[PDB]
Amino acid sequence: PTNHQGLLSWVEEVAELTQPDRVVFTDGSEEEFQRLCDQLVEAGTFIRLNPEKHKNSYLALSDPSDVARVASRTYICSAKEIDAGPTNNWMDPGEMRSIMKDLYRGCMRGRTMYVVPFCMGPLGAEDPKLGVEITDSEYVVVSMRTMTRMGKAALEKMGDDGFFVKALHSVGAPLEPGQKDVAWPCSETKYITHFPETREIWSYGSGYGGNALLGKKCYSLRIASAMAHDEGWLAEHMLILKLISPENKAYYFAAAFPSACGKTNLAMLQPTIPGWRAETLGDDIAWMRFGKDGRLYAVNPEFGFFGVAPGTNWKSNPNAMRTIAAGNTVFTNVALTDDGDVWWEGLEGDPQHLIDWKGNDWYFRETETNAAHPNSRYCTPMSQCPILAPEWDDPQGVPISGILFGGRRKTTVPLVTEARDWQHGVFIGATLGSEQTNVRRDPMAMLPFLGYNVGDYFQHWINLGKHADESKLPKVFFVNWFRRGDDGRFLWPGFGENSRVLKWIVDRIEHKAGGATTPIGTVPAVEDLDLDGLDVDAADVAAALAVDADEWRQELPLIEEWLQFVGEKLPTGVKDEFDALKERLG
Template identity: 45%
Template sequence: MPLDEEPEIPFFEVHEIVVPHLGHVPIVKGDFTGLPKKIQQFIAFYADYMKPRGIFICDGSDEEAHMVINKLLERGTLHHLPKYEENYICSTDPQDVARVEGKTFICTKNKHTSVARSRAGAKGGLGLWLSPEEAKKEMDERWPGCMAGRMMYVLPFCMGPLGSPLSKYGIQLTDSNYVLLCMRIMTRMSSQVFNLIGEGDFVKCVHTMGCPRPWRKKVVNHWPCNPEKVLILHFPEEHKVKSFGSGYGGNSLLGKKCFALRIASNLARDEGWMAEHMLIMGVTNPAGKERFIAAAFPSACGKTNLAMLKPSLPGWKVRVVGDDIAWMRFNDKGELYGINPESGFFGVAPGTNWKTNPNAMASFQKNSIFTNVARTADGGYFWEGMEDEVDKDIEITTWLGQPWKIGMPGKAAHPNSRFTAPASQCPIIHPRWEDPEGVPIHALLFGGRRPEGVPLVIESRSWEHGVMLGASLKSETTAAAEFKGKSIMHDPMAMRPFMGYNFGHYLQHWLDFNKPPNKMPKIYHVNWFRVGKDGRFLWPGFGENIRVIDWICRRLDGEDIAVDSAVGMLPKKGSIDLTGIEDKVNWDEMFTLPKDYWQSDIRETIEFLDTEVGDDLPPRLRQELNEQEERIKKM
């Protein structure tokens, strides 16, 4: 047996079906000849290119999912968690645990279609470009024969509600049945998609773990991958994504960041809409008035917690539309409407518990997949943050398969471990979350982890000033990316890892929306993470964040509860309802604007944007930066 030690366990007796396009590659499941010709050609080309042992055309059904789950249970890739209904856990190879931003490229004929005209010293953090010629060279070293001895799964999926005018379609080819199961949760995966595409356009997604048989390296955790050769290529001019070597999250679930942000942002630019790294939530005040808010935070900065907020103020109701990605467009009346293109939650597990996010916890009590978390001896899951919710003495198996107990050194779960759960199971999912028309967006929020200097909430002075606040977004780094340690990092618009084209052109795209008949939503910047002199958070966060949402909604209603400052509009003292938490909040410390800090911050921001975006930085944005710098000088 080869070193991969992964015997194939067939679903069915395989029948050799010779299709003219495919040679002797057998169709294991599905009706290839009944597919639209354009889709047949796509499958046939890559079957010939990647040489799979068979083709499995998926329909997204429960029966199909159970076949795959049983196969992975038998193999040892998945383990059932008997405390729950249809919940499963798996662990990846330890070398495959995060996004691979340094190996993720946009491939276009013109370099500056993809990346800005940066200046000397730029780090290239706002997207990486690879020429088509270089991309072909890299592909030729990897893709030919990459699925030899493995099954090729054909995943038809829709981003957004099936049939919605705001939705887009894709087909992913993959040799990972784990990816099949997760894509089934995260997208609308259905054989209907083949008919909805017909002979029309679709996004072509090609993924492989990069481990053809026989594989001469030892497979760890039943997770074949090829970390030395990982590469993710986007071809926006061809509406295509190709991913090699990794099975982790957004590297392999290509409907997520690759399609819904990088490719979709190109589509949005060309078609006049917005594809953003944003949650969408509906908030209803005690009087019954509902507002919808879209918010952009870097990964692991609280998007899911905010989207599923359990309000501490009586009479408020929060309902989630989406927790990670928003597609938004202005209608004929100039009203901004948004949809959640995903159908599941792919959330960071550590820190999530019944206190911090009970609605997320309720969402994954069944029909969910957990990746790189720990297991308890009684058949449950565990990660850091759940110490108060399990028996202190219970035996735990870490994500690396080691025995462990609470209080021992090290971590039981990987810091970037994840849950993948159907959005429909969230107890506060909004009844309009699959509305084909979307929901109206009344306000946009930006925010990150800023331990120093940045107040709890800032209202922008104008649409253009708000775009500048988004472009200036910074945050403490988290485990979601491939970076180590804690440092403040630029993450403009929370899109730094997900930009699909020239960031300067992207900012201009935002600025261009401010024209008749468009009614522009107000823009805010929030910071739940400022730390006081004693090293503790100045704001209690979590459910208390509804108090800031309350202030924002009152501002949307025109209440005079804001005061001008050098950096934007701040709440008038006492205008945020602090009933019951007065002793936990030092208002003056939370809203103070240290002049030295802000002078240094604006200079560093201008230097960053001048270096990374260079001559592509829109003149109006440069004007906003200069005006803010002048206001800060006069503080």
Template identity: 45%
Template sequence: MERGTLHKLTKYPNTYICRTDPRDVARVESRTVVCSVDRYATECHTKDGAASQLAHWISPENMDAAMQERFPGCMAGRMMYVIPFSMGPIGSPLSKIGVELTDSNYVVLCMRLMTRVSHDIWRVLGNNEFVRCLHSVGCPRPVNYRVVNHWSCNPEKVIIAHMPDDRMVVSYGSGYGGNSLLGKKCFALRIAGRIAYDEGWMAEHMLIMSVTNPKGVEKFFVAAFPSACGKTNLAMIQPTLPGYTVRCVGDDIAWMRFNKDGQLMAINPENGFFGVAPGTNHQTNPNAMAALQRDCILTNVAETADGGYFWEGLEDEVDKDIPITTWLGKPYKIGSKENYPSSHPNSRFTAPAKNCPIMHPKWEDPAGVPISGIIFGGRRPEGVPLVIEAEDWKHGVFLGAQVKSEATAAAEFKGKQIMHDPMAMRPFLGYNFGKYLQHWLDMEKPGRKMPKIFHVNWFRKDQNEKFLWPGFGENIRVLDWMMRRVDGEDIAEPTAVGLVPKEGSINTDGLNINWKELFSIPPDYWKSDIHETRRYLEEQVGDDIPPVLRSELDRVEARVDAMK
């Protein structure tokens, strides 16, 4: 606060607003690299030398040169902080330890929210392996340029580098959360993914939730969606059907391993939520809003004159006449004709998970929670049914590998193009994607209780660009169908692309739903889609496509081509 980086929001206890340099507002995927001696330990053997979209390799020599160019003297005149943290409950056999060095006090505060920062880490650490995390905003003092919004950064020199062999992350130039809170995507997905590959478990970009039906039966699900596809909303939904209860275990990352009884167990390695603010309100996600009422840091949102926060989506919850200051310091009024938003599209809330009123009592259980189903999904405006069930584990891995979605504001991409995001892990892979797919296939072993795998699409539209499904709390109806499928109910029928609900098997009471359109599988669309999926996998994964998955692709493509 003394330096102007944070400003207190007087309307809420212990809550602060932060505005970054407008050049430092999102993950920088083009500057995010993985270092390995063998290029193909990181990247796949892409076809015809195509640029890899699934991981960006940097050689050890180029890595050393990049570090030497940036790090010597980079913290001069600044405070260096040493942050010991645990991903997962401290001392859990499923948890991992990290230590981050940083010269950003914003990072210190956010790491205290997002991870378990404690002196107890040193006791647990002992001689155990830990992930080394080094971060600098790249602005030694005294600075000889104008610092915007009291936010130090060095956008021209940004690099976020991972060394999986050394269990190390090095980040320079950006203070934005996805680039600087190194326990999050960098450790919990890219480095942990490689550790999971070596040790035989799974580190995934997935929420963890439980659903309890009116009979008191509870089942846990994990779900992988690309950014801005409703992952946090699903993790915290308020069911519209009476008698159902949803509890949140985590909204973004799941670490999973099979126990000695063959049951897949999952923990949330994080301690808080780092969610997209715009679109979050008491209608779309009341539980997230409850978590924001105290002890939070809000980044790149607008501020109301009475010391509150504002962003797109809160128009009906804030006094229409109250003066508002945008994230760029401009005046703003609800309903006025300004052609600029109040908040950055990727503005964020950082809040402690314990603030969420529906956190599961076992959300910090060191043993984890038992997973019955895995859900993939994306923002697909046309062609893709509301829900598809995989025929078996192999087909489920294939469904995950062909996930696509509209691009979002979480990275530097612009526009609404449909992008491949296999397993919702495209930006978060720490090793060769072909090996990653094989690792998924290798999870299926005799004696293991393999979860069912589903694919959902809440975002299909009709010819008038209207959503065919209401989403949000109504998604409990699809989760109920999944629970019944996990229990073996005969409520699914085969199609060329997988199992879909038998007509009427999802409770749509009170909804105006066009069932046939919502679950239609247009042959021309799917023929084009499966051929495009093959093109993508052949180009991006090439010879590294596991043979079993190649056979699955051939099988599904043949069935789709035979559709009338």
């Protein structure tokens, strides 16, 4: 019962409303972490995994109704609907508060209310962005300890009157005295609400992932994008990659991809060409701000990895596997092996029997249901990653040389393209297309995560570049690892071989590589790429890099219909780039 009167007043007001059995301020210590884990094992929420294979690690199985972030229940409650905009779900904030305050009344009966102080980004910073999550979920507390810098240090940073993001959460499952709880409490009624003006997050009904770990997307992207809008910086859905060349020079890249585009594989790249090395500072969120020298510097505001498990394996991402191998991990909805290890679809091992994510027996080449839930997760400290860059915890961040945007496209979009200038780069991000069941637009990979109007967000990107030293700005590139030939072959082998594309990108930044001037930007010819040691058909690489005018003419009305959907706040500068592309295509 410490504080910081503003924090204490808020906690008292919330507890008065939700009526928990007791209030606990968390300190982030190892002692606390093990105590909370013991209680989770006792509740059945966790089982302890075999410590010989994952030290200090646990498996949680969720209610099948609560297995993912729920976009349709996620809201931006700005004072005016336009400031939420077409990529957001809006409700009048007074109306929303009436609904949610009703839901929160008595919602924590029979439960401990945890008050969880945390810092987004390195503690060493001057004004770090601070938050406090109030939650009635012990699972949330433990995962927040991994995903953020949680506890004592953060609370100290708040001082006696420091600003912090108020983040309120309940699973919405009050208990009567002596009532037996379930392993994974939740509600059929869910809201994940953001109040951008006041920098507040209110979540109810889910204990899962981005709905409940309020640093993960709610703070990192939604609230932070609104802060960045007002304060002159960028909060983005980007991995941060450090690439080191044979001359032993480091280059930092920030890269945004939508889901199902192999983003984690790239973040933990093992280059396949001699003399090139890669290290990571993060694989999800990047916060970028101009430094004194006029360059853009990136910091990872998170402290852990929260990755989709299925598809992660030794043969495609051994670095992720090695990070997980060091333990201290909470797994959610993966399968349990006979020796207390874990498994998920895509992983090596061919286990003959498993217990699946619903607690049922599963048998190899027999059971027709997935052993792990398709959205199952590992939650693991970043500090364990064997290719973690030494700069990972530097509050000054790292200077960004290139910003990459990527998506999955069978046709049309070449393997790599460089923007003509910053404004063109913004257009390339703003019109990022990726395959859906045909092409979904996911601008900067932020479609579900913007804290304000998408058009205003594009204008913000435009403004930051206009007012910057142009020579200091990151160069912008678009990458498509997934282009296919008419017969369905993959034109580019991908994975570690993506290091060859990254080498072209570095060389372009240094003016040491050429390329063709095409209507869509600068695109290398096959001979501009290092394919030495790579058994690939040059004709396939040529096809991967082709820019076909007829294909791009068909792309135009898709882009135009997206730009119309962006609505009244679409920047003139984005429309300018559309018009210029159309003119160049002829």
